[PDB]
C-alpha cells in the first residue's frame, strides 16, 4: 500500500472497484460515497437558441461546463446564426490565460428536411379521421385538420399504399390508404397536436432528395467565412456524402473537423466506410429513431461508439438525453441514466438540443450533465477498456503512437494528475485521449482552432499558449511545459507533489513527438 | 457452422463469438433479428388507465407478467377489485392450458410516506406547520438548521432557518409551484416506523387475498425485513418478500437486507432524491450486480417510458434505460405511471416487450455466464450441481430450451442465475409457483393441471412431454431442436439432480 | 468458502489454494511442497519389456507400481521372443477380486525404416550413428540418422503377427503423412481393425505435417529420440509442446516418450532434470508417459515406474485447472452430439461440487474420453464389458477402467443399475470414493455405444 | 510491419494467439531465433574449466558469469581461479564495442557434512559413529557432525542421497566412497569457515555471493554482516536448498538480492517428486518480486561425459527458462566434465528457442497486473519504456545506468527488446548478468564538460556497439531511458528514436 497519499485518496474515484478482477466484481464494489476526483473529461455540446442566445447566459453555460456550442441551421437566417456565433464568441473572451476555456462553434446543417406547412396556430388530427397529404401548392398555407402540406412534392410517388408517413419527431403517425391526383389519401394511426412546418419522416421509403441540397453548400460557405471550427454534416450515408461536404467547403475550410451524422438505415450499414474519410461521428438519436425501429437505436448507439473508440475518433451522443428539463428543474430517472450510459458506453461528447435551445432550465442542464458525467468517467473499468483497446489497437512505428500508450501506461503506474503534452494540431493529445487515460490530458497549443478542436476529445483540456516563442527552441518548449503546470495548479487540476507525465517532441513542427518525461510538481 | 448459415446471423451471434467485450459491442447488428423468447418480465401498476378486465387482456397480450397493485393509494376495496379484474383477464386464457400465461400479483406496500395550486418563490419564507404543512409531527425534531426539505418528487427544496413552536420557519432553496398532498422527502434521521399499523392491516389483506409478492417499501436494514414476514404470518409463509431500496442507508446496509429478502427493487423514484441524482446509476448497477452474484431476483423499477404517459413513442433516453437495465443484468423492469394513469398503457408494455427482446440478445453470455459461475461457490447441494451442468451443456449446443420440472420454483430459479441463452421452460403443478417465477428472467412456467398418474416415472414423463408439447405451440421449440431436461429422482422438492440431452421429434 | 464445512484441511490439500488464483502467475506462486495430492494419479505410464522386465513376478510388481500398458519394442527381438513378452504380461495381469483387478495394454512399437570397439578420430541406397552421438559437422566419437523408405516387409509381418496375439495398440514408427497411417490399417487388415494406431512424430516432415496425421490417427507419440536427432536437439520441446497441445485441443491421446528418467537405468534416484522433464510433460497435457531403457534392460525398472507414478501424482494436482478448462471449451466447437453434450456438462457439475469421480458406463471407451479430453479434476470411472476398450482407454488421462463380468440382468434398466453399483464399490474398495462423497453417472437412453444422454448427482 | 518474412521468426505467430493454450498449438520449429540470448549461463570453475585458455572459449561460448564453489579448494586455489577468469575476460578488453563483462561469483560451503577403498552398504544390514578415530567400513561410518548422535533419532542420508539408513539398519544400500555428502531431513548457522571465505571474497572483489543453506532473513543478515563495509555493494543470491528455506521464502526473498533454486540439495532435503513445485513457485515469486532467480543443478548432467544431453535436460533447461528464471546453472557439466565449453553452447542454443516461445502477451498483462503502484520515476519510465518497445517492435531499450538498477527495472516486465545498458561501473556491469535481457556496455571515455553531451555520447556509445553485436540495424527503433541530473537515482525519461 501507499500512505503517501492517505487512506482517504483510495476510497475516492470509485478505486476499490477500479482493481476489482472481473467486470461483475467492479460492479459490485461502486459506491455512491466514493466521489469523483478526476476533472469532468466528456466533452458537453450545447445547442443554441432563444433561451441561450444572451452573452449573459451563454457565460453562466460555459461556467457551467459548454465545451462545444452547436449552430442549428435548420432554422434561422445566416444573419441569426452570424449573432449567435457573435456572442459565444463575445462570452468566450469577456472573461487570465492561466484560466481561459475555449469554446468551439459547430455548425450543424439542415439537410434533405422533409416539412409540413403553416396552417391557416395549433391544429389536432383526430386518431381515426382522414387526412388528405398534399404537394398541390394551392394548398401550401391551406393547412387544417384534415389537409395537410408538404415541401417535398415526390413524396406522392415514394409512399406506396398502406406506407406510414411520421410528422413531429414521429409521434403523429399516417397510413395511406388511398394514392391520388390530389394527393395521398391517409387515416391517422397516431393524432395529436399538429403545429407549422414539422419534420417529416418517411421510413421505408426511397427518398430522392440531394443529400448535400444548394441551401446545404450555402450554410457551409457561410461557415467557412464565419471560421466555424466543425461541422455536424446531416444524414451522411456513404463516402460519398461527407467528399461532397469537404468539397463545398473548399480551399479554406480544409482545417474544419466534419462530424458525420449517422441517421438512417443506410448509414449504419456503411458505417465502416463514412467513419475513414469522416473525423469523427455523431449518433443522431432523433431521426435514427424514426428511421430504424425505436428499439434498436441503443444497438447501433453501442455498435457506433465501440468502433469509433476503436479507430480512435469522436463519437458524439445526441438527442433528448434531458428531455425533461425543457420543462423542469430535475431529469427522469431514465434521462440521467441515458447520460451516464452513453459515458460508459465510450461516448467522446454528449449533447444538449431543446433543454439548451429552448427550455427553462438551460445552464441547469449543463450542470446535470457535467455532474453525471464526472461520476460516470469515475465508474469506467479502465483495467478492462485500456487491455481491450491496446490488444486491438496495431504495432505502430509511429513515434508519436509509441509515445502515447507508453505515457498512458506511465500514468496508470503513478496514478498521475495529468499527462501535459505538447501539440500544433491536437494529434499527440488525441493519440493520448484514444486510450482514455484516468489522467487529465492537458493540450498545450498556440493554434486557437486546434484548441477549439481538441474538445471533440475525451479527456483533453486545451490550453491557448499566447506568448511569442523564446530564442532558443529548448527554451519555448520548457516555458510552456511550465504554462500547463501553473494553469494546472490554478485550476484545480494539479498540486505540489503530484506527479505528471510530459510528452514533447525533439523537433519544432507537427509530428515529432517522441518523448515522455516524469516531474514531481513542485 | 452445421445445420444453419442463415441461423448464425441471427440473435447477435457474430457478437456473441467475439473475443472481447469492446469487439462484442462493435459486432453488434440492427440488422441482427431476435429469435428467443423476450425473457425480462414486465410488471405493470394498475390504475385507472388498466384496470377494466378488458385492458388487462391487451396487457397480458402484450407482455404484462406481473400486476403491480399501488397501496399508496386506494382503499382496500378498491385492490379487491383490481385483483378480481387481473384474475378474470388472466383465467381467461385458461381455456388453453398449452397457451395460458400464469400472471402474478405483488402488492407494494405504501410505507413512511409524508405528504403535505399556489407557487413558492424562490429566496421567501415558507412556514412548515404540524398545527392544524405536512401529515408528521416529529419532523420539526428530525431536521436541524440548514437541513433540506424537499417537497413533490423533489422538484421543490428548503432549508430551515428557525426552529420554533409555530413550526419549522424556512427560506426556498429551489422554489417550484406547489400543490395538495405532495410527497416530502427528508434525506435525515426519520424516526417513522420501519411498518406502519397502515402497512400491516395491507399485509393481511394481502395474504388474506393470496398476493404472490410482496414489495416492502423502504427497507433500511434486515429487522424491516423481519417485521414483514411476521406482518405476513403463517398464512403468507409463501409470499415472497421482495425489498424496496430507497435511500442512504438502505444501500449502504444492503448486503444484510439481501440476505435475508427473497429479492430487491431499485426503487429509483425515492432514490433519486434521497441521494443526489446523479448517483442513482451507480446504486443500480451495484445492486443488480450483487443481485445477480447471490442469484436473487431484482427489479429495476421508475420512469423508465416516463413519457410515454402522454406520448404514443418514448423518448431516446427511455429506450436507452431499458435497454440498459436488461444489459445491466436486471430480472424485471417495471411501469408505474405509463400504465396506472398514462394514454398509452399498452403500447407501454409492447415497448417495453420490444426492447427487452433486443436487449437480451445483445448479452455477452461468453463474459457474463465465465464471472458468474467463477464467482459463485463450490456447492454439494445436487440441485446448484445439476443446474450448473445443464446450463454449461445448454450452452454447449445452443439448446433451444431447458425443460425443467419444479414444485417451488427453485429448480428453475438455480437454472436462471446463470443466464442460459435457452429458455427455462418451468413445468410445475402449483399455480403460486407458476406466477412467482416470474421474478427470474429467462423462466417460462407452464401449468400442469393434470392428476397424478399411477407410476411416478410416467407422469414424470407426461410433464416432461407436456413441456415440450408447449413449447412447440409457443415457438420455444421445433423438431430438429435439441432440449436440456431437468428432474429429480424422487417426488417432492428438493430431489433434482438429472439432466438428459434430448433431440426433439 | 461456505463448503469449508467439508474441513479446513481439505482445501488445503491437492493444490487447491493454487487452484483458486486469478492468474497464471499467481498460481505457480501458490504452488505448495506440503500440500498433498489426493486424486489418484491420471497420467499413463508406459513401461517397454526386456530382459530387465519379463519376469511374471518382476511385471506383477510393475503393474502394482503403476504401470498402465506394456510397450514390446519390435525393434529388437524375434516373434517368438515378442510372444513369450505378451504371455508374461498376461499372465501377470491374470494371476492377481473383480472389484480390483487392472487391466493392462500391450502396445506393439514397430521397427519402422531402421538404418544400422574403434573410435573414429545396411541401407543400400546409401551422417550420424549411435543415438547421433558420432556425425556426420564432424564429431568423431567411440543405428543410422540422415537428416537429409516405407512400411517394410518386416513391419508388415510384425503387424500381422500383432493381430494374431491381440494386440490393442500400435506404434507407428516414423509416421511422415496421412498415407503412411493408411498403409499400417492396411496391414492390420480386417480382423485388425479394433487396434488403436499411435502415430510417432519423429523426423521433421512429420512435424510439419502433423495436422494431417493427427486427423487420420488415434493418437500421438513425441518420439524424442530420433525426433531430437532429426531436428535440432534444441528445438524438441517446440515440437512436444506443440503437439501436446494440439492433441489436447483435438482430444486424442498424446504420449511423450524417451529419456524421461534415463539416469535411473544404473542409479537408484533420477536426476533434477529427469523428474522436471517427467513433471513438465504432465503440465503440458500429455496423457501417457513412457519407459524405456529404464524398465527394458536397468536396474531399477520397479523404481523408474513407481518414480513416475509419484511425480505424475504432484503435477497433476498443479494443474492450473481454471485456465485449462476455459480454454479447452472456449477453443472446441459447438456440438449437437449428445454425448459430447453430456460430457461437458458432467465436467462442470464435477468442478462444481469437487466430485470424488465420474462414473461412466461406455463399450468402446469414446464416452469416456470425451469426458477425458476437459481434463476434470475428479476421476473417471470407466465400466465396460469390454476387455478390450478397457485396455485401451488406459491411453486417455485421467480414466480408470472397470471390467464388468456378469451377464445382462433381464430388465435393462436394471443393468445398468447394476453396473453403476459396480463402480461405486469398485471406488470404495479402491480409495477413489468414500462414504458421503458426491459423484457424476454419465449413462445412456438406449443399450448400444453412441447414446450417452444421461447426467446425475448422487451422494456415496 | 515490413516483410511477411520478418512476423514468421521469433515465434511470432504463436506471440499473437489468443489464449496459452493457442499459443502452444502455433509454436514452429522453422521458426528461427532472431533476438539475443538473453538467459545468464552460470559456469562453475573446475579442473576442466580453470586455464585461461579454455575460460576464453568458455566467454566465447556464453558464459556469463563464473561459479567460484567454496566446498572445495583452498583460498591460493580461488586466488588463481579468480586470475584466471580476469586474465581470459580482459583479454578481450581491447575491443569496447564487443567486450563482454564476466562476473564472479563466490559460492560458499555452508553448513555441510561429510562422512578410496569404496566399500558397500547392503541393505537390511551400520554404525554411524563420531569417534574420532575412524579413518570406516561396510559397518562403520564415520562424519564430521559431532553433534549428529544428539540431533537424530529418524531417516540419514548420504552421497547425494544415494544411500539411507534408519546404530542404524539400510533402507536404501550402495557403495560408500570417501568423504560423502550427508542429509539430515527434518532437524550452525554461518562457519568460522564461511566467514574466512567470504572476507577472502571481499578481498578479492568478487561481484556476487550464493549464500549456502539459507533458512530465515537472519541467515542473510549474517553474511551481509560477514561482508562488511568493504563489502556492501556485492550482491547476495540466498541458496534455497531445503524445507524451511522454502516454507521461509518470503522472509528470505525480502532481504535478499536474488535467489537460487538449487536443486541438488533441495532434492534430498525433500522428496525428489516436489521439487518442480519449489521451483516454479520460488520463480514465480521473484519475477513477481522483480529479483533474479537462478535455476541450478543436473541440467545437463550426461555431458559430463556424452557430447550430447539427453531429452530430458534438454527439455529441463528450456522448461527452466519458461518458467522464468533470469539465470540457469552448469556444475559438474564445467567443473570436471569432458564437455565444458559444449555444456555451455548447449544451454545457450536452448535458452535462446525457449525464450522465443515465451507468451508475452499473458506474461507482460500478468506482471503489469500483480504489480503495485509506484510513485518512483525510474519503474513509473520503466514500464512506460517496455509498453512502448512493445507497441513498435523495437529491437532494443538502451539504458544508462550508474548502479544497474534502472536496467533491472527493465528487465522485470521481460521485453522482447534487448536491455543495453551502458554504465561507466565495471562492477555493476558484471552484476547485471544476474537479470534475465541486460547487455551490459562498460563505457571507459572520460566525462564531457557538458552534461548533455556526455550523455548523448553514452547513448551513441549503446546504438554503435548494438550495431556492431547485431542487436540493431539502420531502420529499427529504439527506447532510450536516461535521467534528468546526474548520479544514480534519476532516471524518468524515455524517448523513441529511429536508428539511421
Ligand atoms: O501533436 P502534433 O501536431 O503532432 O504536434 C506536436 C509537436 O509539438 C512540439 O512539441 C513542439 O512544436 P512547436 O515548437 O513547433 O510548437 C514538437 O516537438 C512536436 O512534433
Ligand atoms: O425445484 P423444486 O421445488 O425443488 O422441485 C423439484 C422436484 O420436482 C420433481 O422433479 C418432481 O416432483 P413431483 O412429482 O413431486 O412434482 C422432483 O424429482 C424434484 O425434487
Ligand atoms: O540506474 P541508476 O543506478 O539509478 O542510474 C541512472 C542514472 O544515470 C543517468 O542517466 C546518468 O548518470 P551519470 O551521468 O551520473 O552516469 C542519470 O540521469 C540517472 O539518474
Ligand atoms: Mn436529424
Redesign the pocket.
Same mark, same amino acid.
Given at each position: 500500500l501507499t500512505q503517501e497519499l492517505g487512506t482517504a485518496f483510495f476510497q475516492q474515484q470509485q478505486l476499490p472497484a477500479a482493481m476489482a478482477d472481473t467486470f461483475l466484481e467492479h460492479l459490485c464494489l461502486l459506491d455512491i460515497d466514493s466521489e469523483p476526483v478526476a476533472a469532468r473529461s466528456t466533452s458537453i455540446i450545447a445547442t443554441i437558441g432563444p433561451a441561450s442566445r444572451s452573452v449573459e447566459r451563454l457565460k453562466e453555460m460555459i461556467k457551467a461546463g459548454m465545451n462545444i456550442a452547436r449552430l442549428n441551421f435548420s432554422h434561422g437566417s445566416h444573419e441569426y446564426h452570424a449573432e449567435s456565433i457573435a456572442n459565444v464568441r463575445e462570452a468566450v473572451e469577456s472573461f487570465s490565460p492561466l484560466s481561459y476555456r475555449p469554446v468551439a462553434i459547430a455548425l450543424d446543417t439542415k439537410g434533405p428536411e422533409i416539412r409540413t406547412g403553416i396552417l391557416q396556430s395549433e391544429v389536432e388530427l383526430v386518431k381515426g379521421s382522414q387526412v388528405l397529404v398534399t404537394v398541390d401548392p394551392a394548398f401550401r398555407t391551406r393547412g387544417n385538420a384534415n389537409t395537410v402540406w408538404v415541401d417535398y412534392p415526390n413524396i406522392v410517388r415514394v409512399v406506396p399504399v398502406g406506407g406510414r408517413i411520421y410528422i413531429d419527431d414521429g409521434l403523429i403517425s399516417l397510413v395511406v390508404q388511398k394514392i391520388g391526383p390530389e394527393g395521398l389519401v391517409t387515416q391517422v394511426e397516431n393524432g395529436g397536436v399538429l403545429g407549422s412546418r414539422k419534420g417529416v419522416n418517411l421510413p421505408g421509403a426511397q427518398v430522392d432528395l440531394p443529400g448535400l441540397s444548394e441551401q446545404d453548400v450555402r450554410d457551409l460557405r457561410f461557415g467557412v467565412e464565419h471560421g466555424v471550427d466543425i461541422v455536424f454534416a446531416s444524414f451522411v450515408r456513404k463516402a460519398s456524402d461527407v467528399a461532397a461536404v469537404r468539397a463545398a467547403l473548399g480551399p479554406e475550410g480544409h482545417g474544419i473537423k466534419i462530424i458525420s451524422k449517422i441517421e438512417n438505415h443506410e448509414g449504419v450499414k456503411r458505417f465502416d466506410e463514412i467513419l475513414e474519410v469522416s473525423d469523427g461521428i455523431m449518433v443522431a438519436r432523433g431521426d435514427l429513431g424514426i428511421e430504424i425501429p425505436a428499439e434498436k437505436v441503443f444497438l447501433a448507439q453501442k455498435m457506433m461508439i465501440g468502433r469509433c473508440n476503436l479507430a480512435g475518433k469522436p463519437v458524439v451522443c445526441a438527442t433528448q438525453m434531458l428531455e425533461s428539463m425543457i420543462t423542469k428543474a430535475r431529469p427522469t430517472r431514465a434521462e440521467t441514466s441515458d447520460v451516464a450510459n452513453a459515458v460508459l458506453d465510450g461516448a467522446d461528447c454528449i449533447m444538449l438540443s431543446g433543454e439548451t435551445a429552448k427550455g427553462n432550465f438551460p445552464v441547469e442542464a449543463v450542470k446535470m450533465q457535467h455532474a453525471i458525467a464526472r461520476e460516470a468517467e469515475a465508474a469506467v473499468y479502465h483495467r478492462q477498456l485500456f487491455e481491450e483497446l491496446r490488444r486491438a489497437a496495431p504495432l505502430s512505428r509511429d513515434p508519436?503512437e509509441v509515445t502515447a500508450i507508453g505515457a498512458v501506461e506511465a500514468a496508470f503506474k503513478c496514478m498521475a494528475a495529468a499527462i501535459i503534452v505538447? *501539440?500544433?494540431?491536437?494529434?499527440?493529445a488525441q493519440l493520448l485521449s484514444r486510450y482514455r487515460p484516468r489522467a487529465a490530458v492537458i493540450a498545450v497549443t498556440?493554434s486557437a482552432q486546434a484548441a477549439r478542436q481538441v474538445h471533440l476529445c475525451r479527456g483533453v483540456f486545451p490550453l491557448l499558449y499566447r506568448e511569442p516563442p523564446e530564442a532558443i527552441?529548448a527554451d519555448?518548449?520548457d516555458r510552456r511545459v511550465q504554462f500547463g503546470i501553473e494553469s494546472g495548479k490554478l485550476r484545480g487540476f494539479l498540486r505540489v507533489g503530484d506527479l505528471v507525465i510530459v510528452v514533447?517532441?525533439?523537433?519544432?513542427?507537427?509530428?515529432? *513527438?517522441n518523448i515522455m518525461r516524469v516531474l514531481s510538481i513542485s
Open positions: 508519436t505538447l *501539440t500544433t494540431t491536437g494529434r499527440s498556440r527552441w519555448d518548449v514533447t517532441g525533439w523537433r519544432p513542427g507537427s509530428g515529432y *513527438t
